[PDB]
């Protein structure tokens, strides 16, 4: 969790997988994925 931790939550990320993300659809946010489901 640690997700109140705004002041030190960049190496979890430091550019360099963002663009993996934003590299989907819509960032893997908006997305759906129907499949077989």
């Given at each position: 969790?640690?997700?109140?931790?705004?002041?030190?939550?960049?190496?979890?990320?430091?550019?360099?997988?963002?663009?993996?993300?934003a590299?989907?659809?819509?960032?893997?946010?908006?997305?759906?994925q129907?499949?077989?489901?």
């Amino acid at each position: 969790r640690q997700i109140k931790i705004w002041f030190q939550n960049r190496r979890m990320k430091w550019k360099k997988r963002v663009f993996n993300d934003a590299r989907d659809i819509i960032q893997r946010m908006h997305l759906r994925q129907y499949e077989l489901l």
